[PDB]
Amino acid sequence: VVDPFQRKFQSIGKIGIDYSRPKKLATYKRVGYSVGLDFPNAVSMAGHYSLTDCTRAGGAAKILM
Amino acid sequence: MLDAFSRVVVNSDSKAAYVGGSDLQSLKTFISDGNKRLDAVNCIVSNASCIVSDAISGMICENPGLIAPGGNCYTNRRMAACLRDGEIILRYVSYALLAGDSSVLDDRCLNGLKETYIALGVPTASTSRAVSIMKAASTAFIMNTASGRKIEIAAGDCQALQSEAAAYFDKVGSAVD
Amino acid sequence: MKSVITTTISAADAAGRFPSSSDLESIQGNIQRASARLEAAEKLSGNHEAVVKEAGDACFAKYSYLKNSGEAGDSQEKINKCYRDVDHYMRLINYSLVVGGTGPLDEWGIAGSREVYRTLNLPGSAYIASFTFTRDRLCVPRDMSSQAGVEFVAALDYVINSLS
Amino acid sequence: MKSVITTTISAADAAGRFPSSSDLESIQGNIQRASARLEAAEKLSGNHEAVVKEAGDACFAKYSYLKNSGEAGDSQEKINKCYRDVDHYMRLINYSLVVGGTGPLDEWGIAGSREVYRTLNLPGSAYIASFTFTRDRLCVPRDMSSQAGVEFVAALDYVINSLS
Amino acid sequence: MKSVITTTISAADAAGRFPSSSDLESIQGNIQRASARLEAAEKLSGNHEAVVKEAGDACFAKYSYLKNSGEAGDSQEKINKCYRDVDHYMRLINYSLVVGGTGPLDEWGIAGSREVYRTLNLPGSAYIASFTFTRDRLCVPRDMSSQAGVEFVAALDYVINSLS
Amino acid sequence: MKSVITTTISAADAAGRFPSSSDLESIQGNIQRASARLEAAEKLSGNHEAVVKEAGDACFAKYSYLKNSGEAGDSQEKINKCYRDVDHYMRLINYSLVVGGTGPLDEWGIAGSREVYRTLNLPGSAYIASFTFTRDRLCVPRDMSSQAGVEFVAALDYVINSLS
Amino acid sequence: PELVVGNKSMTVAEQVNGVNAESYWPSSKVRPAVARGTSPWMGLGVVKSYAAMSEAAMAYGIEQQSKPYVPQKYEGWSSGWKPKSS
Ligand SMILES: C=CC1=C(C)[C@@H](Cc2[nH]c(/C=C3N=C(/C=C4\NC(=O)[C@H](C)[C@H]4CC)C(C)=C\3CCC(=O)O)c(CCC(=O)O)c2C)NC1=O
Ligand SMILES: C=CC1=C(C)[C@@H](Cc2[nH]c(/C=C3N=C(/C=C4\NC(=O)[C@H](C)[C@H]4CC)C(C)=C\3CCC(=O)O)c(CCC(=O)O)c2C)NC1=O
Ligand SMILES: C=CC1=C(C)[C@@H](Cc2[nH]c(/C=C3N=C(/C=C4\NC(=O)[C@H](C)[C@H]4CC)C(C)=C\3CCC(=O)O)c(CCC(=O)O)c2C)NC1=O
Ligand SMILES: C=CC1=C(C)[C@@H](Cc2[nH]c(/C=C3N=C(/C=C4\NC(=O)[C@H](C)[C@H]4CC)C(C)=C\3CCC(=O)O)c(CCC(=O)O)c2C)NC1=O
Ligand SMILES: C=CC1=C(C)[C@@H](Cc2[nH]c(/C=C3N=C(/C=C4\NC(=O)[C@H](C)[C@H]4CC)C(C)=C\3CCC(=O)O)c(CCC(=O)O)c2C)NC1=O
Ligand SMILES: C=CC1=C(C)[C@@H](Cc2[nH]c(/C=C3N=C(/C=C4\NC(=O)[C@H](C)[C@H]4CC)C(C)=C\3CCC(=O)O)c(CCC(=O)O)c2C)NC1=O
Ligand SMILES: C=CC1=C(C)[C@@H](Cc2[nH]c(/C=C3N=C(/C=C4\NC(=O)[C@H](C)[C@H]4CC)C(C)=C\3CCC(=O)O)c(CCC(=O)O)c2C)NC1=O
Ligand SMILES: C=CC1=C(C)[C@@H](Cc2[nH]c(/C=C3N=C(/C=C4\NC(=O)[C@H](C)[C@H]4CC)C(C)=C\3CCC(=O)O)c(CCC(=O)O)c2C)NC1=O
Ligand SMILES: C=CC1=C(C)[C@@H](Cc2[nH]c(/C=C3N=C(/C=C4\NC(=O)[C@H](C)[C@H]4CC)C(C)=C\3CCC(=O)O)c(CCC(=O)O)c2C)NC1=O
Ligand SMILES: C=CC1=C(C)[C@@H](Cc2[nH]c(/C=C3N=C(/C=C4\NC(=O)[C@H](C)[C@H]4CC)C(C)=C\3CCC(=O)O)c(CCC(=O)O)c2C)NC1=O
Ligand SMILES: C=CC1=C(C)[C@@H](Cc2[nH]c(/C=C3N=C(/C=C4\NC(=O)[C@H](C)[C@H]4CC)C(C)=C\3CCC(=O)O)c(CCC(=O)O)c2C)NC1=O
Ligand SMILES: C=CC1=C(C)[C@@H](Cc2[nH]c(/C=C3N=C(/C=C4\NC(=O)[C@H](C)[C@H]4CC)C(C)=C\3CCC(=O)O)c(CCC(=O)O)c2C)NC1=O
Ligand SMILES: CCC1=C(C)[C@@H](CC2=N/C(=C\c3[nH]c(C[C@@H]4NC(=O)C(C)=C4CC)c(C)c3CCC(=O)O)C(CCC(=O)O)=C2C)NC1=O
């Protein structure tokens, strides 16, 4: 099986396959899709967004970032 | 979760005073509005499954790329979740019609929906189209002007309440976009 | 079996709290709308047999294919089960009119009806045809009363929206 | 998407164990029965149009009331949706024959079909009439082969037992 | 109804005499060209739906203004009348093709065609477009014998030269 | 979407200033010329179908070579895309008449049209032939009104000057 | 009419049962039933339906089963297909 950390970072799958019981909107906003951003090579892009965060997995905001 | 009453009370709490005259006067117009709101919620509830069916079927028939292979309605399970979501949207709109204030609709369902449909890849314009079809169908049931059902009620003007329900559906459709 | 009383008792019990004035206003509304509901319950207990008979007759008047091959009512026995089922649905509409919520109709009739109906090849559209016939066979001033008539329509509409 | 491979990979993964000789025997059987399944998939991709056309024709041949009033296929458009749906089910039978489990047929066709079908007033017995027509229109030596034909029957039987 | 046998029987009947050897030679030629005619009849009865489909589709492909207002086949019903009329035409080509004389195609289809079309507003040139599409489309060698193809084209040519 | 309102709100917002009397005079002029624009929008929504049909008919009446070889409208389908595109242009002229600026016509129709038209081999001169045909088919007192008619001419001229 | 008709003298039995039944003879229909124009408010007396199927339910069934959509041959589904969009 998958590590307790690793499951937090990974993903949420589709419903009819991965999870029988439907999920709250809260858990899509809070956990979801969690990718860090690489170091900026320009002055314009630095102070707008945080870099890769550790022991925290944001979701659905990181899509927009 | 706040009704009309709780909105008056919380506003008077930020103002730090008692309830007073004019706010209670508007709330007297609410209680006199009363059975029109009751019968309105009865009209939107007792047709609701049929509203969801017609609205989503109309959403697909306007835009046949949803049912095209690769679209977000292309599967039985996607279609089931689609119908389920339309049912939930009409459910919370009916809650907002009983309460008289959209605090229930904002706290339950509208909070975190845009990011959810972004996260799932649901097209937002198609959802706003389905919400708009539920809007026009629902106000057509609320004025008792449906072309397939004309039920007996005693006569009375209900423009204000229809504008209220249209405000809730425009809140949802504006919220997903 | 959900009603006004069980909802506010169940809610105030869930909070662990004594029943405040809000619950008292709820049961106050129950004893306000009570007279309409009991009127419609009395008249339904009056002519239930003609209601079930006309309902099932229109149900086979629409779908004739049931009594044809049939993977449906294909005997006098199964037509007896047909009119028994319409007797049960009207009996539960009567029970839900007396309790005044959708409690006994939901917990006796609607809950897990779908597994039985998809298992025993029973089409739902035939039931829906029956109930829409009864709902169209209502009267505004003639048979019941305006207001209580509306209550009855609501109950029957709930059955239809639970079945479609 | 369930198959032999995903079952033993999923199981050995769930144990956290390397794949032992038992998994190797499972995939050994997959590559044993493979040739039959792919034969039936080839022939189904051969004449699918006539299969779907005869299937829907017998589907309206049994239940004619759909094209009567109808709360069903009541236009040539909705009969085109009919033959589209039978195209989908045969296409998923083709896919389950290629995968060799009931995987894509279950996850694309069967899962949550019941809510759609009870929501949009679509009777299941019409589909079952179509598939039982196709299953009766099989041949023992003529069209496919004995053993692969049995495989095809099994898949279509699964559809029927998932729908009734 | 014109054929070899009706012409010669009507001829010797006009003379008031028994059929001589000349009429016998004529019906002998009828039973010579018979197998080519009936071969064309078998293939026409085989694939008439596709022929009428390509005919009407090419007919509106050449002339789009038929679907314009209100001048012609602008609605679904009128285009249905189009396809059923071309069904009658191929049915009469099959009939005279079996007879071998242009009798039944003349007396059923050709006689009084002109009077009917002008009052109604039916353009004959679009019919000519349909038949000349089917005339050109057919392959002499691939779907039949050379002799039958000739017979078929001859009948269709008669239709065109009788139309406008 | 540019209009009077968005121009003065966007300008006063860009200054960071309250809307002075000048902005109020601008929107005063908008509600002066509004009646004319809405008259022409009502009549455009009246007979748009005849406008688009005569427009495209004159469009192929001028350039016949498109329906010849064609690297253009070479089917009835592509002529349907032709009349669809003229439907879109008239619908955006309607939208710009309701807004009263060239906003939605520019942001939906004109912006990025040139890459699509040079990429998909679509000549602009055929569109220009269609619009100049509609502009020649205008009337001074007859169909709209003098003043509002002028408004319509201006909008259509803008399309032409954006396309050539 | 012999020159026009040719050989198609119809028998009396076919001509009565033909298309022109009501116009061949019009006279001898025996006791035509007439439906009176009652007001719906007053039912006027004692009537028992005496039918297997209820009067209301039967009229409902006849109105539901009324006229089947006629599937035509050329809207028939081909191999492949695309659903048209409004
Ligand atoms: C299902 C897949 C799956 C994985 C791939 C692992 C990945 C993984 N590794 C660790 C955890 C760890 N992984 C390593 C491994 C490393 N030691 C080093 O010197 C190298 C850089 C690296 C090996 C190449 C170490 C040392 C830890 C413990 C780290 C620590 O506690 O400081 C953890 C946190 C939980 C734990 O402590 O075990 C997880 C989720 N776990 C899983 O469930
Ligand atoms: C180019 C250089 C560059 C940086 C130096 C960072 C700096 C930075 N970090 C944050 C923002 C943040 N930075 C972190 C990081 C963490 N907080 C913790 O408590 C953990 C210990 C630590 C991870 C190891 C977090 C969690 C936030 C968001 C909340 C906060 O302010 O702590 C923000 C605000 C915008 C945002 O939310 O992303 C900025 C500008 N961003 C950049 O682009
Ligand atoms: C309490 C309120 C509440 C909601 C409003 C819904 C919102 C919602 N919808 C989905 C999920 C979904 N919602 C839809 C719906 C759509 N299908 C389309 O064609 C349209 C764009 C759209 C209907 C208008 C679909 C198809 C999915 C499944 C998406 C997928 O798995 O690909 C999910 C993820 C969990 C799941 O799979 O069910 C959630 C949280 N759920 C809630 O709990
Ligand atoms: C517990 C649930 C519950 C309900 C659902 C209502 C239902 C209801 N509405 C009315 C009564 C009424 N309801 C309406 C409402 C309408 N006005 C219109 O223009 C629309 C058709 C419709 C709103 C959508 C009107 C106008 C009356 C008064 C009718 C009259 O007196 O002519 C009455 C009669 C008593 C009264 O006058 O208030 C009742 C029982 N009452 C309840 O106790
Ligand atoms: C307990 C609830 C309950 C009801 C709601 C009624 C419903 C009902 N109505 C009728 C029967 C009837 N109902 C009507 C009413 C109608 N006249 C019209 O012009 C309108 C369409 C409509 C009023 C709006 C009429 C006319 C009949 C008699 C029909 C007939 O005999 O032709 C019957 C058959 C028995 C009878 O003849 O009375 C029944 C069960 N009865 C009940 O027991
Ligand atoms: C408490 C409420 C309650 C109900 C509402 C019924 C519902 C119900 N009906 C059936 C069962 C049945 N119900 C019908 C009825 C039908 N015949 C048709 O032609 C029509 C479609 C339809 C009448 C309108 C038939 C025919 C069966 C037997 C089905 C069969 O065995 O094939 C069964 C399975 C057990 C049995 O065989 O009796 C159940 C639970 N039972 C209950 O306990
Ligand atoms: C991946 C698999 C897959 C399927 C199997 C289908 C299943 C399916 N069919 C319909 C929808 C439909 N399916 C039919 C078909 C029927 N017409 C009848 O007369 C018969 C009872 C039946 C054919 C045997 C009809 C008529 C509709 C439209 C129903 C309506 O809008 O009223 C819908 C809703 C979306 C739509 O309108 O297309 C779905 C999900 N779709 C899929 O994605
Ligand atoms: C991919 C799946 C697949 C099927 C399920 C079949 C189904 C099928 N069978 C036939 C057609 C046929 N199928 C059979 C088979 C037989 N008839 C008998 O009486 C015997 C009992 C039985 C052999 C055991 C016969 C004889 C025909 C031709 C005549 C007929 O319709 O019976 C046709 C019409 C086309 C043709 O003539 O070949 C089709 C679509 N075809 C396929 O491609
Ligand atoms: C036995 C042989 C036989 C035929 C061959 C047809 C020929 C025929 N067609 C029509 C009548 C018609 N035929 C057509 C057909 C056309 N629509 C168009 O767009 C095309 C030009 C054309 C198809 C290629 C139409 C549209 C009508 C109805 C014309 C009208 O009412 O305006 C009529 C008049 C009666 C009627 O309305 O049906 C007749 C006799 N009928 C017969 O009995
Ligand atoms: C009863 C009479 C009768 C006919 C006359 C034919 C006419 C005909 N030909 C084709 C179909 C065809 N016909 C041809 C023939 C041609 N190849 C060329 O190079 C030449 C232009 C031309 C021969 C002179 C070809 C190639 C096809 C197949 C076209 C394709 O699939 O691209 C089709 C479509 C069905 C099919 O694919 O077979 C039909 C109806 N069929 C009939 O039933
Ligand atoms: C919102 C406004 C709006 C428009 C105005 C159109 C403009 C437009 N037309 C086409 C596309 C097209 N437009 C035409 C039209 C033409 N056929 C001819 O013979 C004439 C020259 C011309 C009609 C006068 C054709 C034929 C195509 C398809 C071109 C091709 O695929 O070869 C495309 C590419 C996408 C597609 O294929 O549909 C676009 C963006 N689309 C829009 O969204
Ligand atoms: C919204 C934009 C819009 C247009 C651009 C017009 C365009 C237009 N004009 C006509 C139709 C017409 N347009 C005119 C106008 C005149 N013909 C003359 O010879 C005069 C010089 C000129 C007046 C100055 C006339 C007379 C007709 C009818 C006959 C004709 O076609 O000329 C028609 C056919 C429908 C009808 O008869 O009304 C259309 C679509 N209509 C619209 O709705
Ligand atoms: C061909 C693909 C197709 C459809 C499917 C429909 C779907 C559809 N229903 C509408 C709207 C609509 N739908 C209904 C509900 C519906 N009507 C009734 O009288 C009863 C009993 C109903 C359920 C059975 C109502 C009541 C309305 C409002 C209009 C009205 O008064 O009828 C609207 C208008 C939307 C709008 O106003 O923006 C659409 C597009 N349209 C299509 O083009």
Side-chain angles (χ1 to χ4, degrees):
Chain A
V1 194
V2 188
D3 287 330
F5 284 84
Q6 181 68 252
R7 286 195 295 282
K8 290 176 185 164
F9 292 105
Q10 279 171 353
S11 180
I12 292 166
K14 316 235 133 299
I15 184 167
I17 299 100
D18 293 329
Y19 61 99
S20 68
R21 184 200 33 94
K23 287 179 182 183
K24 304 210 130 17
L25 315 161
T27 195
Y28 291 95
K29 163 203 140 49
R30 290 177 159 269
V31 155
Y33 178 76
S34 174
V35 186
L37 316 185
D38 206 359
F39 191 84
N41 279 338
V43 176
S44 77
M45 299 180 288
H48 293 292
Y49 296 109
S50 77
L51 287 192
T52 173
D53 60 346
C54 78
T55 65
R56 182 173 311 195
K62 294 184 183 296
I63 295 167
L64 293 172
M65 79 186 293
Chain B
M1 187 156 317
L2 303 180
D3 55 355
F5 298 83
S6 295
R7 186 165 201 81
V8 173
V9 167
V10 166
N11 288 318
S12 63
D13 198 6
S14 67
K15 190 172 304 162
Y18 287 88
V19 191
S22 180
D23 293 331
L24 286 184
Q25 195 274 126
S26 68
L27 192 143
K28 291 279 178 37
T29 63
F30 177 79
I31 297 163
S32 181
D33 190 72
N35 300 100
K36 297 177 179 178
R37 188 178 293 276
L38 265 295
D39 207 351
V41 174
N42 196 4
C43 288
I44 189 178
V45 165
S46 65
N47 299 122
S49 188
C50 199
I51 295 169
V52 180
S53 302
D54 186 73
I56 286 170
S57 182
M59 179 189 70
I60 296 169
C61 179
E62 289 293 322
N63 190 2
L66 273 306
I67 207 56
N72 281 310
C73 290
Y74 175 71
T75 320
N76 276 319
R77 50 177 291 270
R78 286 189 178 86
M79 190 59 201
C82 182
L83 296 169
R84 197 267 315 290
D85 291 333
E87 174 216 329
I88 293 174
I89 292 298
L90 184 57
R91 189 161 60 92
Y92 284 111
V93 171
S94 66
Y95 292 160
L97 278 171
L98 278 175
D101 186 70
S102 63
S103 296
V104 51
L105 195 141
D106 286 330
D107 293 333
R108 298 289 96 156
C109 177
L110 184 146
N111 191 10
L113 181 53
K114 189 186 282 178
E115 311 205 339
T116 300
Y117 283 165
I118 278 169
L120 290 170
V122 175
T124 63
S126 177
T127 59
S128 67
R129 179 60 184 165
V131 169
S132 69
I133 299 170
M134 287 184 298
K135 180 172 84 177
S138 175
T139 58
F141 277 110
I142 211 163
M143 203 196 298
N144 199 3
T145 64
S147 175
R149 183 184 297 270
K150 184 152 160 45
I151 45 93
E152 59 274 13
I153 316 165
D157 200 0
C158 286
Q159 292 297 321
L161 208 150
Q162 181 183 0
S163 297
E164 189 174 353
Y168 299 124
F169 282 109
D170 289 332
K171 184 180 280 295
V172 177
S174 66
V176 297
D177 294 334
Chain C
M1 188 176 291
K2 181 167 200 208
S3 66
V4 188
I5 290 103
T6 59
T7 303
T8 60
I9 276 183
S10 64
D13 190 18
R17 194 178 63 85
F18 279 142
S20 69
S21 66
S22 65
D23 303 329
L24 304 178
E25 293 179 10
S26 69
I27 179 54
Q28 171 63 254
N30 208 165
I31 67 101
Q32 187 164 28
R33 200 62 195 158
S35 64
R37 302 172 309 175
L38 293 171
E39 184 176 353
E42 285 182 343
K43 291 194 179 167
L44 200 159
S45 67
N47 289 318
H48 64 275
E49 294 167 337
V51 168
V52 173
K53 188 154 207 164
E54 287 185 347
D57 284 332
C59 177
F60 286 104
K62 184 179 287 193
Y63 301 101
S64 65
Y65 77 101
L66 303 174
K67 197 179 102 216
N68 173 28
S69 177
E71 289 83 8
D74 200 3
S75 67
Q76 193 58 255
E77 182 63 27
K78 289 178 166 331
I79 299 175
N80 289 324
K81 284 184 144 13
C82 165
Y83 297 159
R84 190 191 69 232
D85 285 332
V86 180
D87 276 325
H88 287 307
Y89 274 154
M90 294 310 299
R91 196 162 48 78
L92 294 175
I93 288 167
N94 193 6
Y95 289 165
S96 65
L97 257 56
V98 172
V99 171
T102 56
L105 196 148
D106 186 74
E107 69 184 3
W108 293 341
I110 303 305
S113 63
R114 298 194 180 151
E115 295 216 24
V116 185
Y117 292 160
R118 77 180 62 94
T119 302
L120 301 173
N121 198 178
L122 299 165
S125 67
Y127 288 108
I128 297 166
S130 64
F131 288 118
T132 49
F133 180 73
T134 55
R135 191 206 30 232
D136 291 335
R137 175 62 59 200
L138 280 156
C139 306
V140 189
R142 182 172 98 81
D143 56 3
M144 312 287 274
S145 65
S146 176
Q147 320 168 350
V150 175
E151 297 293 324
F152 175 72
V153 170
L156 198 146
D157 282 331
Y158 178 73
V159 182
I160 298 171
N161 292 118
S162 65
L163 195 58
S164 168
Chain D
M1 189 177 291
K2 189 185 173 141
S3 66
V4 184
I5 290 99
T6 61
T7 302
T8 59
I9 288 173
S10 65
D13 191 6
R17 194 173 72 77
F18 283 141
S20 70
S21 67
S22 67
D23 301 329
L24 305 180
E25 293 185 17
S26 70
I27 180 55
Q28 170 63 256
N30 207 164
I31 66 101
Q32 195 170 356
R33 198 63 189 168
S35 63
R37 303 174 307 176
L38 302 175
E39 183 175 1
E42 284 178 353
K43 291 185 181 180
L44 198 159
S45 67
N47 291 316
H48 64 274
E49 304 158 358
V51 173
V52 171
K53 187 172 152 220
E54 285 183 340
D57 285 328
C59 177
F60 287 102
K62 186 179 281 188
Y63 301 99
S64 62
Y65 76 102
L66 303 175
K67 194 171 41 136
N68 187 11
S69 180
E71 300 82 3
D74 199 2
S75 67
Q76 192 62 244
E77 179 66 30
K78 288 180 168 237
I79 294 167
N80 289 322
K81 285 180 173 278
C82 160
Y83 295 160
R84 190 191 69 239
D85 285 337
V86 180
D87 275 327
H88 286 303
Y89 276 155
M90 294 307 299
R91 186 167 62 69
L92 295 176
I93 287 168
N94 186 17
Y95 287 166
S96 66
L97 258 60
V98 174
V99 172
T102 58
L105 191 150
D106 184 77
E107 68 183 4
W108 294 340
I110 304 305
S113 63
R114 299 176 175 202
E115 298 155 326
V116 193
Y117 292 161
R118 78 179 65 90
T119 301
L120 299 176
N121 209 171
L122 301 168
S125 65
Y127 290 99
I128 299 166
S130 65
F131 290 118
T132 49
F133 178 73
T134 57
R135 187 192 49 212
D136 291 335
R137 179 66 57 151
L138 279 158
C139 307
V140 187
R142 183 174 86 94
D143 56 1
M144 319 286 273
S145 68
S146 181
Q147 285 160 30
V150 166
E151 298 290 329
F152 179 74
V153 173
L156 198 149
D157 283 331
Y158 179 71
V159 179
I160 298 172
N161 290 115
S162 65
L163 195 60
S164 178
Chain E
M1 186 179 290
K2 187 182 63 71
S3 65
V4 175
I5 193 160
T6 60
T7 306
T8 56
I9 283 168
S10 66
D13 186 20
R17 300 175 301 108
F18 303 128
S20 71
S21 65
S22 67
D23 300 330
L24 304 182
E25 294 192 31
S26 68
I27 192 62
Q28 180 67 36
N30 205 170
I31 61 99
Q32 190 193 345
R33 198 58 183 173
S35 67
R37 293 179 298 166
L38 302 181
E39 183 178 12
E42 285 181 27
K43 187 169 288 296
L44 200 160
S45 64
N47 297 317
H48 62 278
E49 295 159 337
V51 173
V52 173
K53 181 68 176 177
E54 287 184 348
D57 289 327
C59 177
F60 291 105
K62 186 179 284 297
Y63 305 103
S64 65
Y65 73 99
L66 300 174
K67 290 187 258 212
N68 202 352
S69 175
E71 296 89 7
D74 54 349
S75 69
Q76 188 57 258
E77 183 66 30
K78 305 286 203 65
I79 301 171
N80 290 318
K81 289 188 174 299
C82 160
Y83 287 109
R84 74 103 186 282
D85 286 335
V86 177
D87 282 326
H88 286 305
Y89 280 147
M90 297 307 298
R91 190 174 48 85
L92 296 177
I93 294 172
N94 193 5
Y95 287 165
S96 66
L97 191 59
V98 173
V99 171
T102 62
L105 189 144
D106 179 78
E107 66 182 358
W108 295 339
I110 302 304
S113 67
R114 315 172 202 180
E115 174 85 10
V116 172
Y117 298 128
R118 41 171 133 277
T119 306
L120 295 184
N121 207 169
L122 294 178
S125 64
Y127 290 95
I128 295 171
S130 63
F131 287 116
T132 49
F133 176 75
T134 59
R135 182 171 173 252
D136 290 4
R137 164 52 74 106
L138 65 72
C139 188
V140 184
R142 149 210 213 267
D143 39 31
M144 55 182 54
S145 85
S146 328
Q147 315 148 333
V150 173
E151 293 291 329
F152 180 75
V153 164
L156 203 148
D157 284 329
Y158 181 73
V159 180
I160 298 166
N161 293 115
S162 61
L163 183 59
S164 167
Chain F
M1 190 178 289
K2 183 170 204 192
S3 66
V4 187
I5 292 100
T6 61
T7 301
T8 60
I9 289 172
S10 64
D13 195 15
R17 192 175 73 74
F18 281 136
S20 70
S21 66
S22 65
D23 302 328
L24 305 179
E25 297 182 19
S26 69
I27 178 58
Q28 170 61 257
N30 206 165
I31 66 101
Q32 191 182 345
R33 201 61 190 171
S35 65
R37 301 173 309 176
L38 295 172
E39 183 180 356
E42 285 175 349
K43 291 182 178 183
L44 197 149
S45 68
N47 286 321
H48 64 275
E49 294 170 342
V51 174
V52 171
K53 172 215 142 195
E54 285 184 346
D57 284 329
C59 177
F60 289 105
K62 186 180 280 189
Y63 301 99
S64 68
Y65 75 101
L66 304 175
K67 170 158 85 181
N68 195 2
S69 178
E71 292 82 6
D74 199 0
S75 70
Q76 192 57 253
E77 179 67 31
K78 289 183 185 262
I79 296 168
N80 290 321
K81 286 179 178 276
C82 161
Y83 297 158
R84 190 188 69 241
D85 285 338
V86 180
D87 277 325
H88 288 305
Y89 275 157
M90 292 301 289
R91 190 167 57 73
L92 293 176
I93 290 167
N94 192 15
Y95 288 164
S96 67
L97 258 58
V98 174
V99 172
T102 58
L105 191 146
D106 186 76
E107 71 185 0
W108 294 339
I110 305 303
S113 67
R114 295 174 179 168
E115 295 201 25
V116 187
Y117 292 160
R118 78 179 65 92
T119 301
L120 297 175
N121 208 174
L122 301 173
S125 66
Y127 290 98
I128 299 167
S130 65
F131 290 117
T132 48
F133 180 73
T134 57
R135 189 185 57 200
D136 292 335
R137 180 65 62 178
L138 281 158
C139 307
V140 192
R142 187 186 73 85
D143 56 0
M144 316 288 273
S145 68
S146 180
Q147 305 178 351
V150 177
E151 299 287 328
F152 177 73
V153 175
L156 197 144
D157 282 330
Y158 178 73
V159 178
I160 298 170
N161 294 120
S162 65
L163 198 55
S164 175
Chain G
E2 193 193 36
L3 200 139
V4 188
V5 176
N7 58 359
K8 206 177 151 211
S9 68
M10 296 178 63
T11 63
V12 186
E14 291 175 357
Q15 192 63 260
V16 170
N17 288 318
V19 189
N20 283 324
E22 287 185 329
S23 185
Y24 183 74
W25 55 255
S27 165
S28 194
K29 298 168 216 138
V30 164
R31 300 301 308 288
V34 170
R36 68 268 179 96
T38 61
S39 67
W41 291 284
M42 189 63 195
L44 190 138
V46 173
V47 170
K48 303 200 194 185
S49 303
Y50 267 122
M53 222 78 156
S54 72
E55 312 170 332
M58 288 301 289
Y60 178 80
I62 303 295
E63 287 174 357
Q64 294 296 321
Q65 292 180 357
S66 69
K67 281 196 155 195
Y69 166 85
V70 194
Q72 66 211 22
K73 191 59 179 101
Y74 293 95
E75 284 184 13
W77 178 73
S78 66
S79 296
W81 193 55
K82 63 172 198 172
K84 291 160 199 171
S85 63
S86 63

